[PDB]
Amino acid sequence: MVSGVTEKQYKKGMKKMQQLEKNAINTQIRREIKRVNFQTHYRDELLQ
């Protein structure tokens, strides 16, 4: 209470804080999704 934020501002700060934490997660998944499935030594169990 003394150090600035009251309860409703704690709520309104937490919400946007969480949101900006989730935005970056959506971005990281998008920007990794291409070269996450890129296997160095996949064996391809098929010859005949």
Partner 1 sequence: SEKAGHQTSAESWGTGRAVARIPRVGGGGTGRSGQGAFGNMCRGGRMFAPTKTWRKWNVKVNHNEKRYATASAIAATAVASLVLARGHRVEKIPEIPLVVSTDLESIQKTKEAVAALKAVGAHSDLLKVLKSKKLRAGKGKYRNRRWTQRRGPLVVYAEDNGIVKALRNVPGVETANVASLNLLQLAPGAHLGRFVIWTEAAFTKLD
Partner 2 sequence: AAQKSFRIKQKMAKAKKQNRPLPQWIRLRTNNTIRYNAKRRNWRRTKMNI
Residues contributing to the site for RNA (CB under 7 A): 2-4, 14-16, 18-20, 22-25, 27-28, 30-31, 34-35, 41, 43
**Contact criterion met (CB below 8 Å) for 19 and 12:** no
CA gap 39, 34 in Å, rounded: 12
- The residues that touch partner 1, with contacts defined as CB under 8 A, are 28, 31-32, 34-35, 38, 40
**What is the amino acid identity at position 1?**
M
User: Is residue 5 close enough to count as binding partner 2 by CB under 8 A?
Assistant: yes
Stretch that binds partner 2, among 13-21, 26-34, 36-44 (CB under 8 A): 13-21
